Structures are given as C-alpha cells and as structure tokens.
C-alpha cells in the first residue's frame, strides 16, 4: 500500500530561479564568493592571453593551407614516432593487468585476518589514503636538470615553467617569488 | 619514458584506494578553472583542443600532465 509523493518546494524554486538567471550569470565577479588571484597576474597579462587566444579560436582549416610535400613527410614522422609509442603504451596495458592481479590476491586475504587490525584497514581514515602531496622525489624534480637540457628548445621548457606559475597561482602555492 | 615512471606512484595508491584506476579529481573556482586549462594548451607533452560546457566541473585528469 503506497501512494504518490507530493512535491518539495526545493525542486520548485530551482526550476524557477534558473529561468531568472539564464540571462544573468553567477560566475561574474564577487557575486560568487571569489578571492582575487595571485597579484603576479595583472590586467595587461590577461590581455596578453586573451588577445592571442582570440587569435587561436579564429583559426580553422580554411584560414590555412599546407603543401603536400610537408604533408607526406608528416606521415612517416608521426607514424613511426607513434609506432614506437604503441609498443610502449601496450606494455602499460599488460603491466597494469598483472599489477591489479596482485591487488586481487591480497583483498582475498585481507578477509583472512584477526578482528583488531581488520577494522583499521577497512576503516582507515581517508586523510592517510588522501595524500596527493608532492615529495623531493617527483620525476619533474628529480630529472629537472637532465630534462631541461634534453629538449630541442627552451620554448618547450618554457611550456613547463609558465605552466607552473599558473598552477601555483591557482592553489596559491606561489608567493612573492 | 616518463610515462613508465608514474606507473609506480600510481600503483602504490591503488593499494591505498583498493581501486584499479586513479584520478586526482580537483574542483576549481572560475578564475582558477580557466588557468588550469591554459596550462593544458601549453604542455610540451601534449598538444590539445579543449571542449567544455559553460559551467565548471570536477575535472578528471591524469597525473602525467599534473605538476606544480
């Protein structure tokens, strides 16, 4: 014996508030609780981004043509470069299989424990499982002086350095550097 | 070969999470959310074209392109 359920006013307002707010926006400014960014960023530096990203969105296949001679070489280059990588990539797929088997063996055995420690392992605090902090050991740090010299260009390194100042500006991990 | 290095750092967390697949799952405010995408146009390891909705999202990115 069960009857229909009536509506909550919460579902009502959300249906209506949107239509008030499709025209407006919630992202635009301190309407949202928003702190300013790292002051290394400036009004002019965003225009440096905008003025050139405005250029990238306006690109197409019709603003551009390419010579066939450049194209035919591009096959053998990126085909064989990829061929080395398919060999590399398909290994990880094979590797991760055997890695996951090892996890499956133990999870069968974790049941085969006493009462005390079996509580903790199942009921661990997520703070310990939630460690995504860096270390002195990170392959971007450990191999930095090597990798800085292995590339063909400084620009492709500048792809890394300018990338971090952004992410450092996001999590606010940069300060007065 | 860097791709072959992160297999370890990802492996150990499979035991910590008891999962076969791991993603870092950040969620950003608007300004932070755009700059993280500028990062991703300008990686040396990946050339990208980005697609999204008008609304920020819990992004699900691999550690490989992650860095600070």
């Amino acid at each position: 014996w069960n009857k229909k359920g009536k509506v909550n006013e919460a579902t009502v307002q959300a249906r209506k508030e949107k239509k008030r707010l499709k025209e407006t926006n919630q992202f635009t400014g301190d309407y949202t609780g928003e702190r300013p960014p790292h002051p290394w960023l400036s009004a002019k530096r965003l225009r440096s981004i905008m003025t050139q990203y405005q250029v990238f969105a306006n690109k197409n296949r019709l603003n551009i043509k390419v010579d066939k001679k450049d194209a035919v070489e591009m096959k053998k280059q990126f085909e064989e470069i990829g061929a080395h990588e398919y060999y590399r990539m398909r290994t990880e797929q094979i590797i991760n299989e055997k890695n996951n088997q090892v996890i499956d063996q133990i999870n069968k055995e974790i049941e085969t424990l006493p009462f005390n420690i079996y509580e903790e392992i199942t009921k661990m605090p997520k703070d310990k499982i939630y460690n995504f902090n860096t270390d002195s050991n990170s392959p971007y740090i450990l191999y930095f002086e090597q990798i800085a010299r292995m590339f063909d260009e400084e620009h492709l390194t500048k792809l890394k350095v300018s990338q971090r100042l952004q992410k450092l500006a996001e999590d606010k991990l940069g300060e007065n550097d | 070969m860097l791709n072959n290095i992160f297999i370890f750092e990802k492996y150990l967390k499979k035991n910590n999470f008891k999962k076969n697949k791991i993603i870092l799952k950040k969620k950003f405010t608007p300004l932070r959310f755009f700059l993280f995408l500028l990062s991703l146009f300008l990686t040396p390891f990946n050339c990208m074209f980005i697609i999204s909705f008008k609304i920020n999202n819990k992004l699900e990115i691999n550690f490989e392109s992650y860095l600070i």
Partner: peptide, 16 residues
C-alpha cells in the same frame, strides 16, 4: 557556446 563563453563572462570583471 562552450569554453568560449566562460571567457567573456569571468575574465572582463577581474581586469578591474
């Protein structure tokens, strides 16, 4: 639409 619609909305406020 898409990513291009954050950017006329979010950025032009924080320029000032």
């Amino acid at each position: 639409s898409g990513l291009d619609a954050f950017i006329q909305l979010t950025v032009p406020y924080w320029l000032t």
